[PDB]
Structures are given as structure tokens and as C-alpha cells.
Amino acid sequence: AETHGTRPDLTDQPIPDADYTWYTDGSSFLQEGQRRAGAAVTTETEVIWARALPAGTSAQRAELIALTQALKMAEGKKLNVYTDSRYAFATAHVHSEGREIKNKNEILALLKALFLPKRLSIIHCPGHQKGNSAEARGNRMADQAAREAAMKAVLET
Numbered sequence: 064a065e066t067h068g069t070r071p072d073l074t075d076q077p078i079p080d081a082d083y084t085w086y087t088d089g090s091s092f093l094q095e096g097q098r099r100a101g102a103a104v105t106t107e108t109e110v111i112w113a114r115a116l117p118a119g120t121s122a123q124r125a126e127l128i129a130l131t132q133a134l135k136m137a138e139g140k141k142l143n144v145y146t147d148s149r150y151a152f153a154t155a156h157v158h159s160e161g162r163e164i165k166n167k168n169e170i171l172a173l174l175k176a177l178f179l180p181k182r183l184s185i186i187h188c189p190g191h192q193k194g195n196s197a198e199a200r201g202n203r204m205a206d207q208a209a210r211e212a213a214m215k216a217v218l219e220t
């Protein structure tokens with residue numbers, strides 16, 4: 064059992080009896096001078112949810128938002144969720160003591176959402192993998208979906 068965490072039964076390895084295995088990604092890039100962002104939750108082949116986010120949204124914030132959405136949609140179910148964000152992983156797994164100086168709203172929302180799934184593992188996966196393994200395909204799908212959502216919104220459709 065992890066220590067100095069927020070949800071005592073949270074693990075970082077896949078649970079055998081998971082209902083859902085999902086992949087999250089937050090995308091942030093510069094376009095026409097401003098920072099743009101998107102977030103997504105996917106399986107290897109399906110987009111469960113993807114949205115463009117407000118201008119100025121950092122990649123870190125987008126990653127928190129994507130992970131939060133996965134937790135919300137998995138309320139009452141057993142979830143393995145993969146993120147390639149070290150920031151989102153650490154925010155979910157390690158409790159901090161001080162006032163949150165950045166992303167305070169998104170951190171609070173994530174911490175609340177941790178408690179929604181019946182059982183939960185938040186797992187790190189490498190990003191930009193070339194394989195056709197489940198993790199490679201899932202992470203790729205989430206990255207593509209988040210970037211597509213962000214691009215479509217900036218271009219207006």
C-alpha cells in the first residue's frame with residue numbers, strides 16, 4: 064500500500080479484475096501566437112471523451128483534466144488508467160502539504176475524483192511509442208484524440 068498518498072488503496076500496477084482499461088492525454092501547443100490545449104480519454108481503438116480546452120491551458124493542466132475525466136466516467140467501476148504524464152501521475156499518487164500555487168482548481172478536482180472508481184490503478188506509460196502493443200496503441204489513440212480536439216477547435220471546425 065502506497066504511503067503519503069490521497070486515496071489509500073490506489074495502486075500503480077494494472078488490477079487483474081478491472082472493468083475498464085483507459086488511456087489519457089493532455090495536448091498543449093502554440094498556434095497563431097497563443098497556447099492551445101486538448102484532453103482525451105480513450106481505449107486502444109475508441110475515443111470515450113475528447114475536448115478542446117481554454118487558450119493558455121498548459122500541458123500539465125490538460126493532463127490533470129484528462130485524468131480527472133477518466134476517474135469521473137469510471138465512477139463505481141474498476142479502472143486501470145494509463146497516463147504518460149509524470150506530473151499527473153505524481154499529483155494523483157503523492158499528497159502535498161502546502162497551498163497549491165498552480166493548477167489549484169484542477170488538482171482539487173482530480174483529488175476528489177480519485178475516490179469515484181470502485182477500484183483504481185493509475186499507471187505510467189511511455190509516450191510516443193512505435194509498437195502495436197496495447198499500451199502503445201492506447202497512448203497513441205489518446206494523444207491523437209487530444210491533439211485533434213484542440214486543433215479542430217482552434218481552426219473552428
Ligand SMILES: [Mg+2]
Nearest residue numbers: 088089147148
Ligand atoms: Mg501525455
